[PDB]
Design a protein around this nucleic acid. Structure first.
Lengths: 84, 44, 270
RNA sequence: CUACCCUUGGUCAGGUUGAAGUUCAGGACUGAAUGGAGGACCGAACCGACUUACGUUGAAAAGUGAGCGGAUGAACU
RNA sequence: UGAGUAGCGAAAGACGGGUGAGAAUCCCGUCCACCGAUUGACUAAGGUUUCCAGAGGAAGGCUCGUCCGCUCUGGGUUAGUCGGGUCCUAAGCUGAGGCCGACAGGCGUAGGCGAUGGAUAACAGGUUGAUAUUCCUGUACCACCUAUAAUCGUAUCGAUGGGGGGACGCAGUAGGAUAGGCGAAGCGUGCGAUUGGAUUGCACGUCUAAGCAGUAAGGCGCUGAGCUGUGAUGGGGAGAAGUUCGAGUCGUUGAUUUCACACUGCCGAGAAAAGCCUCUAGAUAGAAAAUAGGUGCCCGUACCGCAAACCGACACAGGUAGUCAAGAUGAGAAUUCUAAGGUGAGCGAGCGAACUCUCGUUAAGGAACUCGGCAAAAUGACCCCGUAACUUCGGGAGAAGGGGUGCUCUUUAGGGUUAACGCCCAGAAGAGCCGCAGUGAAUAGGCCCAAGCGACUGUUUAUCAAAAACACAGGUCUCUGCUAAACCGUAAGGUGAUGUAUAGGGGCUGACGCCUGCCCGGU
RNA sequence: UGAUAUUGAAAUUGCUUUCUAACCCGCACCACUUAUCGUGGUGGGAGACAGUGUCAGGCGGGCAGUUUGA
């Protein structure tokens, strides 16, 4: 399904790209099993494993007034066959 | 010296939480009276 | 009997423990124990309604049977034991077809006895309509089938006086002479562990690990805490009578409502 | 926070003395060993707050320095 | 205004070189000093993004600032096994029915929630500026699914029911073992310019879970058992050498760890439920040993955590649970100097006035001070002698009062371990050498004679009173026969008590010894 | 502590005794139901008494409001 929302392209994301591990921001309510079937449906690849982590919302100002960012969910799938 | 506020999330929610206000006639009065004033935070 | 202690500090100087050579085994029978958390003078509302209770060692409640109901099956005393929560000792009695129970041990008990409506010697438990006059019994019932309540502490006993047609006249240990319904069981003998009276607890610490807290005298409280109140320096009672903490004459006055239905059963006073 | 209680846990460097009991030898009692009791003893952690100094628009709306008391218990947590 | 006044929050910095508009403060470096039963390492709570990188210096920072826990821009938290849930239950809470009650509602049964306890499968090494039993490498184990399965058949599954177990206090020594520590063998580097020495000098000396045995002790031919040896491991770390190489020893000491609440003693008599294993009810009917594969959810994980990040309005001498815990000296977690690792205190520079504070010494005297020896001095450690009255026979007692202690060298019964050698712990005595002084520093009882109070240990006015006050063991009087009395509540319901007159409540007194006289007008 | 309602039936004398169906039992056993609760039944005990309602007298610093002159 469309639980996968964004690819992560950071220094550490690209660094782990070398190890054949890919990162995504997924919806805040999914397992690491729904992420697995989702990636295997979309990219037609075999998944070796998938880690997952939650980030707090962190408060950001940009002006007079305060407020948090969004709580986000950072999944990391290790491929077994193919790439991307 | 040991001061009077010693923070504790479990106690704070057990004694002032939402579910503990929704359990009394008077807790419900408390929440209604905070909505009459229009508070942002009802419970704690 | 009680065993003295040599005065090696100030606190074992005048202090006697109880010897426990009538005790056989020190660990209890696991099948009969029950938890027993300390409700330290607090009732269901959470408030202190009986003073001077609190603390003390842990306890495991032993299921003692006071019913003493069996179809005239034999028994056999395994072993006397210690019970942390009554003055008397208890005895593990095994029945013929294999049951385990605790009796309150009367003095001089290792034999192995029975329960029935008619046997009698020390240990047995039979109805008061089969006990001759002058006998001393213990652990008497008051209603037919509830277990025994009267004469149940350590060193207790009760003589069977004469008998009515439906009642038997018991003399309690307080001098109470009473009619008891003639189908209420009672056990033969006196309740052992007779030395308990003579023990000298010897120090405030030993009083304090039996669940007894300090009893402040009302004469040193303030006027809003006790009728014996304040007064500069030590004052006397300064009232016609002494009073309890709650404003009741605490000396001499009869406070017996009871139930006002034993009054056709209570011949003598105390 | 504080006062008491309930349930469940944890902590208490080290050293000294030597109760019953017991066993050996004697003759109920003696001496030697063994034993290791106690709101026992000296003393750090820990818990207190006795005395004096300082501080008192304080480092602190009750503290600090030097000494001080309890330290297997009615202990502390 | 006070006023350019008080304060700038315990403490050691110095210098060189950088960077820069600007340097006591920022970066680096060398030296110096401080902690080191902690100013170090790891964690619970709590905080909640403060963590990291690159820029910034208007505000915050008690000065400065090029710097920062601050501003901006980007990032960073990875789990079948770690701590919780998909397990269990204490206290407590909630409680359909139910009982009680002007309403609101109280109480409470079946049941449920509820950890601080029980149960429960993964360890070692590497890695990045930021994670790390999570990633990666290596080697495992657990639950479930699937196929092949040698050997199918009252063979399997077995209740939410029965049973056993789990399952438990407190002290005391004794023992095993191991961690760790110390000392000499094997390695690895250096080998000196100030007199000398080259037997000299530094630094290192292994490693998991799991799986194979088998093992002090312990309990009842069984159950549990630290531990050790082996492969794991031709692997990894490794002081140091030039991607290729490199040692890993016996000796002694040994815990507060662990066998282990084991054994023994005591009295104050020391959780529950499940997982677990059984038995039949009852489902009538597989293979677990094996071969191969496969799946394994949610939540936390960053950082600080004796603290500049938590609680005190502060970047505040205060408070904050638990774990590890080295060397020399020692009884020792004491004192003093160091290790590991970490810090140099977020205002300085002068001059060395009064006065205040902290600290040292003082001729002669020695409490003459003062309300009062308050404060300060003094004593103080270990081995030795010696030790009064009095006494409840325990004590007083460390009574009091005195002596000794350094280093060297000789002789010399000793203890432990060892096949001995060899280490390890204790000395006697004798001869000497030094000094003003020998527990040469630090740490560490002043005592005695009497009187009053309280018997004692203990408690008390958080924040001016710690005592003679309170408690206390003991005495006594009194009420209460059990749906007990007494207390809470309007009542239900409770506590007393799953106790029952050798018990329970209340009043007074307060160890122990000897005693406790008279009166019933009156209340 | 009395009167009276719940509250009946017999006897000697309003007083007194007896007795069961009320009412009552923190008595036992059974069923709800693998519940020291509750309800129902059965046995036992007590018994027209207790408990409760309305009226009345008394005690009553246990608690309450108050007064205590210039």
């Amino acid at each position: 399904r469309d639980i996968l929302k964004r690819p992560v392209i950071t220094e550490k994301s690209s660094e782990a790209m070398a190890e054949d591990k890919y990162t995504f921001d997924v919806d805040t309510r999914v397992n690491k099993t729904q992420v697995k079937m989702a990636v295997e449906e979309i990219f037609n690849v075999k998944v070796a494993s998938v880690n997952i982590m939650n980030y707090k919302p962190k408060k950001k100002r940009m002006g007079r007034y305060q407020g948090y960012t969004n709580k986000r969910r950072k999944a990391i799938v290790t491929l077994k066959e193919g790439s991307i | 010296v040991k001061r009077t506020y010693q923070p504790n999330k479990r106690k704070h929610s057990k004694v002032h939480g939402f579910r503990k206000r929704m359990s009394t006639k008077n807790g419900r009065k408390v929440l209604a009276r905070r909505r009459r004033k229009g508070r942002k935070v009802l419970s704690a | 009997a009680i065993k003295k202690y040599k005065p090696i500090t100030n606190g074992r100087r005048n202090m006697t423990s109880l010897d426990f050579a009538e005790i056989t085994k020190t660990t209890p029978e696991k099948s009969l124990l029950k938890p027993l958390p300390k409700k330290a003078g607090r009732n269901n509302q959470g408030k202190l309604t009986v003073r001077h209770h609190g603390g003390g060692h842990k306890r495991q409640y032993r299921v003692i049977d006071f019913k003493r109901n069996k179809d005239g099956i034999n028994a056999k005393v395994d072993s006397i034991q210690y019970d942390p929560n009554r003055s008397a000792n208890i005895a593990l009695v095994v029945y013929a077809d294999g049951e385990k129970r605790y009796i309150i041990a009367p003095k001089g008990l290792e034999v192995g006895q029975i329960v029935e409506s008619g046997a009698i010697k020390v240990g047995n438990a039979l109805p008061l309509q089969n006990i001759p006059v002058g006998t001393v019994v213990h652990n008497i019932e008051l209603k037919p089938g509830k277990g025994g309540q009267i004469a149940r502490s350590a060193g207790a006993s009760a003589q069977v006086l004469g008998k009515e047609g439906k009642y038997v006249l018991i003399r309690l240990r307080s001098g109470e002479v009473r009619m008891i319904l003639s189908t209420c069981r009672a056990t033969i003998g006196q309740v052992g562990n007779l030395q308990h009276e003579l023990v000298n607890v010897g120090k405030a610490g030993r009083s304090r690990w039996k669940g007894i807290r300090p009893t402040v005298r009302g004469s040193v409280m303030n006027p809003n805490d006790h009728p014996h109140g304040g007064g500069e320096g030590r004052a006397p009672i300064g009232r016609p009578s002494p009073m309890s903490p709650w404003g009741k004459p605490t000396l001499g006055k009869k406070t017996r409502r009871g139930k006002k239905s034993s009054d056709k059963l209570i011949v003598r006073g105390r």
